[PDB]
Symmetry: D3
Subunit: 20 residues, 6 copies
Amino acid sequence: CXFXLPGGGGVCXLXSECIX
Amino acid sequence: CXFXLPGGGGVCXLXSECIX
Amino acid sequence: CXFXLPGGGGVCXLXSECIX
Amino acid sequence: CXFXLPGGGGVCXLXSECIX
Amino acid sequence: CXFXLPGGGGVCXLXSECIX
Amino acid sequence: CXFXLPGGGGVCXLXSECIX
């Protein structure tokens, strides 16, 4: 976090911070 | 959560986890 | 659309209007 | 648009360009 | 938070809960 | 686009495709 900067990196919107 | 999966279901973007 | 309500009613954030 | 800036003004995430 | 609601009346998408 | 994939690359949620 914050939104656009997912924990662990990678694509924002794809994975645990999003659906996952 | 995460983004696009509201904890109480229904409409994502709609309810506690969004505005609410 | 709008944001959160894809046309045809799929999950918001999952598919071409998002990543896809 | 873009995301955060609804085209007709007002509050991002609240109104026709979001749910509405 | 939640998504779209900084919590103090500010602009969603601008500050710590977004980039920051 | 879609949401999460800004044109030109770059961070999603920052610059013209978001606020900007």
